[PDB]
Write a protein that binds this ligand. Structure first.
Ligand SMILES: *[C@@H]1O[C@H](CO)[C@@H](O[C@@H]2O[C@H](CO)[C@@H](O[C@@H]3O[C@H](CO[C@H]4O[C@H](CO)[C@@H](O)[C@H](O)[C@@H]4O)[C@@H](O)[C@H](O[C@H]4O[C@H](CO)[C@@H](O)[C@H](O)[C@@H]4O)[C@@H]3O)[C@H](O)[C@H]2NC(C)=O)[C@H](O)[C@H]1NC(C)=O
Ligand SMILES: *[C@@H]1O[C@H](CO)[C@@H](O)[C@H](O)[C@H]1NC(C)=O
Ligand SMILES: *[C@@H]1O[C@H](CO)[C@@H](O)[C@H](O)[C@H]1NC(C)=O
Ligand SMILES: *[C@@H]1O[C@H](CO)[C@@H](O)[C@H](O)[C@H]1NC(C)=O
Lengths: 418, 418
């Protein structure tokens, strides 16, 4: 299997809107938010928060966490079919979910909070997690095989006060699952030498900017450190979660990340929520301790606001950015594929690009230039011999009754012709 | 060979004392200690509670603790309690209805994991999930798994019932098998009952349907509750399996918190009166499986209720009102029992310890005042040297104390009548 590996300005990329099923309702004045997508081994997982009003200020109505199957039906375009749906009782308590596949089940670790977003009310939030095990091929009358609620028996956080799932999906390594997560370490306990802040090429950048930008605000009580939550399924009835922090190599505030397996080894993506606006992506060198071999990427970034806009590399105290991930599709040329937002300061213009560390080979707009879009989650796979890529794109302020995310299906061309 | 005072006396032969019990120490304020549990067994004890910051009903769950220890006479010629092991589940809000039972060198406690709240108040929403914590009464050094372990229930053989739950403080052991107090959720549509069995012989304002409709939280309740015993055979303990045993038709009452204990050789069973059978339901178990209790013709002990089914109401009405005030058999030849009751027609007040026969209260003593709000009481009695002793945990509420918590008393049964 090979792909087009030459720079073409032609439209060799033709995005198609995938066929996906969901539970049916007749509700109106609704926005589908906090999305999730996790494709693995011909299966998928999907979650969202339904709001009665605006996508920002609406009242929470229904959270659904669902699993299913991706399929080819001779149309040679992937289709999605939901097989199991779980609807928690309290929409407003469920936060930052992350789904990981193993055996015949999707394990989704979510965060329970009665104060609000646990990242914005860190000090007020009391740590609480939840694990939902859903079967991708349900059966009839099998007690706690289709839907099981797993209870954490102990959470090893180490030096960290609180830990929380913070990302859409994770990997498996044998019978041990690794979720994207974040740790809440007090600022006073944070070990950082400002002599390691890269302000040796920046004028108005202070050496203190890196450290102070490791929390939501400069005078925050905690810093945020992205990492992994380990759930060893072979450890009997003790459902123990263990936190694994990321290393200092290109360190940035704890952001939503996603660990995935491709062509053998694992890969890691960390959203650029601070001053390192260029994409953070790379092969995981070690899963424990976590060390990522970030790519020398110079072409793909993310939108920001005023202090840290797109293509900013010099340290500043900021907390801006969007989670737009990318999926390795060829390790020998490190070609990745994903959706990025082609605007400097606003969340607009989604563009599916098959890019390299210093070159966007071919891209294709997924909407118009002033189309508002935010979080993108892209997972790719091999159907027969052709690489296909499913991309969930968050669209907002469409002026519709049921504003929904747009799920795409983009086949990576093999030839650079036509 | 041990003797007890078998005569009625208006004097104060009974002198209660506040027991010394050690718990892990904090210094936080504005807290309520709820969902208590006490179990005494072979000179050992188990204790559980839920710490709530704020209100005793609508407070934020802070700390669930599960504990075991030793009951010893340290020369003060009074029983004392000393904790040896503790476990603090990580999500306190999910732990519900816990039930401890002792075997060999461990206390096994079957709890309920729920994210909808009290499974009895949100029965249709509850997804059955159970937890089992094996704790060592005498811990050893660096002995992981020996000290604290979780026995994932794996299988639950409910039978004709949809959901099953631990619903009672303590249980017994028969050889290598563990019997926990339990409840059983049956959809009304499958509840077999002959309304002609509803005793409305001397109750003019009572219909016959008033018995079948009082077998649920409400008359239209989707589920009826039937108390029983969840079994656990350790002798084949590899892939643990729980098995429900239902209580017989004799004196059927809505599934209420129950207690099975061994006294003077044979098992005894106590069911709370959460419906119109306001009189105490106590008696020797004739057969554990099937569960058959030979309830007593007790005509002196009842429980506070409300307007419909108040204290000393023997007539079938549709009610779900009552408190858990158990009792412990102290003499079988004269069937004398010992426990705490609340002396108020229609309020949870005036806790009163009493040693009582079927149709007579021999001697009794007030524990607090006459207006002290008090709810649940768990009473377990035992023999220290040659003197019968009784430990009663009383739930005391409404005081405004910085730390509201249960009151644990130790009472010596008079042997000769002063
Ligand atoms: C992301 O980008 C970094 C670089 O920015 C990549 O890592 C670098 O890789 C180059 C080689 O490709 C390394 O360069 C080598 O450095 C040796 C020592 O000089 C370096 O010393 C320190 C580290 O020891 C560096 O920090 C410093 O800046 C110097 O660059 C040289 O001796 C080497 O020379 C040898 O090879 C060259 C090339 O053939 C010959 O001409 C020489 O004669 C000699 O044989 C070489 O120049 C560099 O050290 C690496 N940096 C670090 C920090 O490790 C990452 O690989 C890249 N990541 C991805 C995913 O692409
Ligand atoms: C998970 O637990 C099993 C059983 O103790 C062990 O054999 C395995 O190595 C563990 N895997 C880890 C810690 O990654
Ligand atoms: C975004 O900002 C950079 C600043 O270096 C600038 O070079 C670039 O042209 C800007 N892009 C747009 C679309 O304005
Ligand atoms: C409690 O109930 C009994 C029976 O109804 C009654 O005789 C008694 O007077 C009641 N007590 C009070 C204080 O009303």
């Amino acid at each position: 299997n090979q792909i087009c590996l030459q720079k073409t300005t032609s439209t060799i990329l033709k995005p198609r809107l995938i066929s996906y099923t969901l539970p049916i309702n007749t509700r109106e004045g609704v926005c589908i938010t906090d999305p999730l997508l996790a494709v693995d081994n011909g299966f998928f997982a999907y979650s969202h928060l339904e709001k009665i009003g605006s996508c920002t200020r609406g009242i929470a109505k229904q959270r659904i966490i669902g699993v299913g199957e991706v399929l080819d039906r001779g149309d040679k375009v992937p289709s999605m079919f939901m097989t199991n749906v779980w609807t928690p009782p309290n929409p407003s308590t469920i936060h930052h979910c992350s789904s990981t596949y193993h055996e015949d089940f999707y394990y989704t670790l979510c965060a329970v909070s009665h104060v609000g977003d646990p990242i914005l009310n860190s000090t007020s939030w009391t740590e609480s997690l939840s694990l939902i095990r859903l079967a991708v091929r349900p059966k009839s009358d099998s007690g706690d095989y289709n839907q099981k609620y797993i209870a954490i028996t102990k959470v090893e956080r180490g030096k960290y006060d609180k830990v929380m799932p913070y990302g859409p999906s994770g990997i498996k390594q044998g019978d041990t699952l690794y979720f994207p997560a974040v740790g809440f370490l007090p600022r006073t306990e944070f070990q950082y030498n400002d002599s390691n802040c890269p302000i040796i090429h920046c004028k108005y950048s202070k050496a203190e900017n890196c450290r102070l930008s490791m929390g939501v605000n400069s005078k925050s009580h905690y810093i945020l450190r992205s990492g992994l939550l380990k759930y060893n399924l072979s450890l009997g009835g003790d459902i123990i979660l263990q936190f694994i922090e990321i290393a200092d190599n290109r360190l940035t505030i704890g952001s939503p990340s996603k660990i995935y397996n491709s062509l053998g080894q694992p890969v890691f993506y960390q959203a650029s929520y601070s001053w390192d606006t260029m994409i953070k992506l790379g092969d995981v060198d070690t899963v424990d301790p976590l060390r990522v071999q970030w790519r020398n990427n110079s072409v793909i970034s993310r939108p920001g606001q005023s202090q840290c806009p797109r293509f900013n590399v010099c340290p500043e105290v900021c907390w801006e950015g969007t989670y737009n991930d990318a999926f390795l599709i060829d390790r020998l040329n490190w070609v990745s594929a994903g959706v990025y937002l082609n605007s400097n300061q606003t969340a607009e213009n989604p563009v599916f690009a098959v890019f390299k560390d210093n070159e966007i080979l071919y891209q294709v707009p997924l909407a118009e230039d002033d189309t508002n879009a935010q979080k993108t989650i892209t997972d790719c796979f091999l159907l027969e011999n052709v690489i296909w890529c499913i991309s969930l794109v968050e669209i907002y302020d469409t002026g519709d009754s049921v504003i929904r995310p747009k799920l795409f299906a983009v086949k990576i061309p093999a030839q650079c012709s036509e």
